[PDB]
Ligand binder design. Structure first.
Ligand SMILES: [Cl-]
Ligand SMILES: [Cl-]
Ligand SMILES: [Mg+2]
Ligand SMILES: [Mg+2]
Ligand SMILES: [Mg+2]
Ligand SMILES: [Mg+2]
Ligand SMILES: [Mg+2]
Ligand SMILES: [Mg+2]
Ligand SMILES: [Mg+2]
Ligand SMILES: [Mg+2]
Ligand SMILES: [Mg+2]
Ligand SMILES: [Mg+2]
Ligand SMILES: [Mg+2]
Ligand SMILES: [Mg+2]
Ligand SMILES: [Mg+2]
Ligand SMILES: [Mg+2]
Ligand SMILES: [Mg+2]
Ligand SMILES: [Mg+2]
Ligand SMILES: [Mg+2]
Ligand SMILES: [Mg+2]
Ligand SMILES: [Mg+2]
Ligand SMILES: [Mg+2]
Ligand code: NA
Ligand code: NA
Ligand code: NA
Ligand code: NA
Ligand code: NA
Ligand code: NA
Ligand code: NA
Ligand code: NA
Ligand code: NA
Ligand code: NA
Lengths: 143, 81, 82, 56, 46
RNA sequence: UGUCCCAACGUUGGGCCCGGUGAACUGUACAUUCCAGUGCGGAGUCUGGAGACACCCAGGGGGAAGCGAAGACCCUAUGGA
RNA sequence: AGGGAAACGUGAUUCAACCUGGGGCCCAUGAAAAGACGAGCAUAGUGUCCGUACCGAGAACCGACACAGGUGUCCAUGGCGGCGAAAGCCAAGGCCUGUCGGGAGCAACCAACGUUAGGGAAUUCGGCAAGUUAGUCCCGUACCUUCGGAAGAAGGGAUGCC
RNA sequence: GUCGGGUGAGAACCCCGACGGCCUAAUGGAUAAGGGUUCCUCAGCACUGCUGAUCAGCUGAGGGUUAGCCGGUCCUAAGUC
RNA sequence: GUGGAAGUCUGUUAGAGUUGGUGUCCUACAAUACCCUCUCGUGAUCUAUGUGUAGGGGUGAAAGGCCCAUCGAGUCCGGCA
């Protein structure tokens, strides 16, 4: 008995990898007799031919670690492999910062706390990298 | 002068088209267009050709898959020959 | 029928990446000898196979308890894990 | 790179083809000229007195 | 590759010329296809 | 730091035995050789002695001026480029 | 509609495809033509001809071979990992055909290789081969120099898990 | 790869199940060129297959490629006639 | 601080090359291969497909290199016994 023809068919009818298709060891004779895609679907319904289950990788251990790293752990010198600007792209980070500081100043203006001249001044000093952060900015603002 | 139809192309797969889709398969001369096959077929078997699909075969001839109108029956037209 | 402990120490004389295969052969040769039967007549239930390949092809266990029965018209032995 | 075996691999180009005129597989499809009968070059058929011995 | 209608035709002929001498010709001639061509071992023209 | 003193042990694939498959190089003939001698002055074969029961397995290659290539060097040709 | 045994979700982040903007460079200036738009709607007819199988490679191609060689394009967003299209491990998918097997603790010898005390280049034409160092962060850094560089100089410290 | 099992006159290597592995820009998926029927089915083992073969890209006979809207076709490029 | 220049650096990304091991092979897997190591890797870069240049002539960042395993003058046939 040579069921390799069937395998190929079974693989397509079940819409699975030939390697996952399963033929019951007690019906090689019947299955050996399947010749059409139909005879196959039939043998499928009787459960003689079935598709094994595909596995998936378990991200459990990966989730735990993901928590520890979001909480700040497992990121010491001995756990870094990439250069510093590799782990954090300095240009991207300056865009993050400056947009914060520019957004902040923008609010205080519309809010009224700042006069278009005070704003202007601050803005110009932000673009000049005078504030390490919005907090640093607010502080400077209060004289 | 060459004739368009050569003879009916009877094979397992030619049977299924016939029984299941009302189609007649022929071995035609390769210079024949879908048009010439259509007319030649109607005039020979007195039927209405709805569609003609062709293929230049690895046999050196041209195969033609002719579908007849629901009004005619492939199984019957082919049965008389 | 009886239960026997098979020593697989001679499987080390065979390149390590091929221990499982040699083990298997050793079992059969042990049963065929201790149950006075031809190795042809010895049948190993898959259980024994899986026990031997449990940890890969090169990490076979130094022993294996196997339960075997002997009988029939040409003489033979059927075996399995325990 | 070896001029031998390794340079033989890149040979998947088509040049000489069945000739419309003579039937020999010598119709260079890139030059559109037959190296055997001269189709595509000469109306007359390619032929030379050196294709045979001087006195024959 | 992309073949033409002419090309396809000849390949077709070649496949036909690649059959064996019918058993009845053996009998009729009281006793070999010298042009047998294998796709791998040989090479057609064009 | 096994490059060395200075070699050791181990791992894997061969090697060795078995089944199957199954080439090639090479071959004037003879041939179990060794020590001397002789010879166109570099001998398994001549001469004198010595040694030598026949067959087979593995080995590392001393010899057959071993096999492989009508010497690339040198000279000669009323040669070639 | 379809598909699914069944449920037949909703929010979010990062966002290949695709869309759309700004800037910089050239002693270098980055095709053309057909066609399309410009130029509406109904209904009907027509839309011929040629290609379409399979391989696309450690057996379907070239290399005399089922040759460890050679041979273009697309998938570059599957998971862990990490700077990464890197290593290692693992899915999906594919395979056990880089296609002869059996046996001997399996000797000498050889191929690839591990480990070797004390010494430490004594080896050798020569440190050939092998080895040492190694990722990241902080500290620190000579001569010289075309001021760019030398420079990761050197040297010193740290490095996990909870 | 191994243990079972299927088929067969004949099975280490054809097929089924389990276990054990190998490939992760490839040993996966889609293709260009080139090959030209090698594709599928059935029947086979004198040849081919680095051993064997019930298997096969082998032998024999049958069958298989369907397009207004995927390519070609049309256009023009270096350039060619 | 921003900016992101460069025949720039590291880099078996892909890809291109070929320094050493004078390793393996050397009747080969291979009439130029294998492995480890190593160079380049945004540019005078690499590559597919098309196209141009022909034998005392091409092409040559020049080695007398290359022009289908053929090059101090390709190959085929003829002169030719
Ligand atoms: Cl902008
Ligand atoms: Cl196409
Ligand atoms: Mg920056
Ligand atoms: Mg068509
Ligand atoms: Mg050459
Ligand atoms: Mg046929
Ligand atoms: Mg004597
Ligand atoms: Mg000489
Ligand atoms: Mg000289
Ligand atoms: Mg001269
Ligand atoms: Mg297809
Ligand atoms: Mg092979
Ligand atoms: Mg030591
Ligand atoms: Mg010294
Ligand atoms: Mg070194
Ligand atoms: Mg087939
Ligand atoms: Mg069969
Ligand atoms: Mg560079
Ligand atoms: Mg680099
Ligand atoms: Mg080119
Ligand atoms: Mg010179
Ligand atoms: Mg030639
Ligand atoms: Na016919
Ligand atoms: Na061929
Ligand atoms: Na060593
Ligand atoms: Na010798
Ligand atoms: Na990733
Ligand atoms: Na085999
Ligand atoms: Na600046
Ligand atoms: Na190399
Ligand atoms: Na010349
Ligand atoms: Na001559």
């Amino acid at each position: 008995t040579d069921l390799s023809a069937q395998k190929r068919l079974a693989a397509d009818v079940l819409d699975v990898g030939k390697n996952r298709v399963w033929f019951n060891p007690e019906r090689q004779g019947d299955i050996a007799d399947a010749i059409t895609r139909e005879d196959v679907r039939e043998l499928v319904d009787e459960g003689a031919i079935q598709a094994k289950d595909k596995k998936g990788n378990s991200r459990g251990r990966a989730r735990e670690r993901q928590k520890k790293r979001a909480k700040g752990h497992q990121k010491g010198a001995g756990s870094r492999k990439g250069k510093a600007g590799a782990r954090q792209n300095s240009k991207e980070d300056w865009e993050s910062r400056i947009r914060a500081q520019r957004t902040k100043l923008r609010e205080l203006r519309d809010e009224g706390t700042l006069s278009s001249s005070q704003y202007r001044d601050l803005y110009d000093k932000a673009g000049g990298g005078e504030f390490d952060s919005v907090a640093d900015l607010e502080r400077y603002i209060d004289a | 002068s060459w004739d368009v139809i050569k003879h009916p192309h009877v094979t397992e797969k030619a049977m299924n088209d016939m029984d299941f889709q009302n189609k007649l398969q022929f071995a035609v001369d390769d210079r024949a267009s879908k048009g010439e096959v259509a007319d030649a077929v109607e005039e020979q078997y007195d039927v209405t050709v709805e569609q003609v699909n062709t293929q230049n075969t690895m046999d050196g001839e041209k195969k033609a898959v002719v579908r007849l109108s629901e009004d005619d029956d492939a199984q019957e037209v082919a049965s008389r020959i | 029928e009886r239960v026997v402990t098979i020593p697989l120490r001679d499987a080390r004389a065979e390149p390590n990446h091929k221990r499982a295969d040699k083990a298997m052969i050793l079992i059969r040769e042990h049963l065929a000898k201790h149950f006075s039967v031809d190795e042809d007549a010895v049948r190993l239930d898959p259980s024994i196979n899986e026990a031997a390949w449990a940890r890969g092809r090169a990490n076979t266990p130094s022993k294996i308890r196997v339960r075997a029965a002997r009988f029939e018209e040409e003489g033979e032995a059927i075996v399995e894990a325990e | 790179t070896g001029a031998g075996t390794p340079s033989q691999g890149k040979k998947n180009t088509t040049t000489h083809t069945k000739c419309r005129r003579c039937g020999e597989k010598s119709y260079h499809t890139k030059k559109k000229v037959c190296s055997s009968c001269g189709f595509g070059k000469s109306a007359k058929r390619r032929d030379y007195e050196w294709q045979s011995k001087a006195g024959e | 590759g992309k073949k033409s209608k002419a090309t396809k035709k000849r390949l077709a002929k070649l496949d036909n010329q690649n059959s064996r001498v019918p058993a009845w010709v053996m009998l009729k001639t009281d006793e070999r296809n010298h042009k047998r061509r294998h796709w791998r071992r040989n090479d057609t023209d064009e």
